[PDB]
Amino acid sequence: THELQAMKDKIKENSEKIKVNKTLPYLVSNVIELLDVDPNDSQRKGKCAVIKTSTRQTYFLPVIGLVDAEKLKP
């Protein structure tokens, strides 16, 4: 029952890694949002998201990471 402080230490150490890898906001970007899951054709789970950039590029990424689909539509 005393391991709650130990888990508090591992979430402080890993959130310290969230302080060094947030991962930091630097480059400005814009979003494109969608929901997906992969049946095959074995079965797995997950979700994806899309993004814009300041360099005009676009990327296909497993769902953010860090904050979630909570907000927003892009």
């Binding site: 591992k10 979430i11 969230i18 994806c48 005009r56 990327y59 296909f60 497993p62 990471g65």
Partner: protein, 353 residues
Amino acid sequence: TKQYEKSENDLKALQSVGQIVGEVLKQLTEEKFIVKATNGPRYVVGCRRQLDKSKLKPGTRVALDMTTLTIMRYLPREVDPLVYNMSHEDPGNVSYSEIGGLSEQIRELREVIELPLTNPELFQRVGIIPPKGCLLYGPPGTGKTLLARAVASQLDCNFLKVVSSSIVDKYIGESARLIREMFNYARDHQPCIIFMDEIDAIGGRRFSEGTSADREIQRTLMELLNQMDGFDTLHRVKMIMATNRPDTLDPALLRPGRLDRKIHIDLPNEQARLDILKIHAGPITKHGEIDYEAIVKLSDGFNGADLRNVCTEAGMFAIRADHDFVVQEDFMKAVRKVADSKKLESKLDYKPV
């Protein structure tokens, strides 16, 4: 405590880098598929082992690895602007009856739009081709924008408004493609409806050509033509068009097809203006003394908003006295006198057809 570690384990999945978007162009062999980055370099890579090329096909939006660039995951359809043109909402519905006149403007547009949707058999019963669009114009009288706005939430079904402004897109005004990019979901979400205000300034003539910003205009027009010039059937989309004048559009638009029907508004009759004041006099409560024809016979040759706003302005001009309820006395003065000032700039409002 445990949920925080869950968000930590969430972050243990996030160090994995996001892949690169891709469009599968065509294919060569099972290890080689023509693909291009959004920035233009074309590649041929291998797939992952779960997929069949029936799950890919040429001309398919996909994703690639960040190093091997291998085909892994995908989504068929995406875009930014589409749904964000949907969300404008008009109170009514019942605003249908709140536009006052006019019947053959009101009623015919129902037969022009509604019945095509529900009963295309009644088109093939006679054999007539379905009208795929509609056109308003003006502004004698007014209401071209609200009657649209009203019918959108009235007719219900699916409708998507086209904001006429941002299309120019600053750099590289090629955004006529976005109409296809919008038409593609109009072929997906079909049926769906489109209102367009201001087709005239995007109706550029290239009459006597000049400078630069006209060239991007006329080019953005060529697609609008070809999109309706198909090679395609847009019938499940209903294109509604209204603007200042139906003149500069050049004859390409002015023919049916692109412009399916001729509908417009004129100065509402004082008989119909008698009704336009009711929907103005409804939301305002006063002392019970009213003669509707008084303002109708005094105030003459106006528009619904012009009447209403000044009628409300009269109530606002009359409430300047700080008293609450106001008889038409002030209104038989204010609306009379105030609109006289408003009819000073009624000059030069009469435009070609």
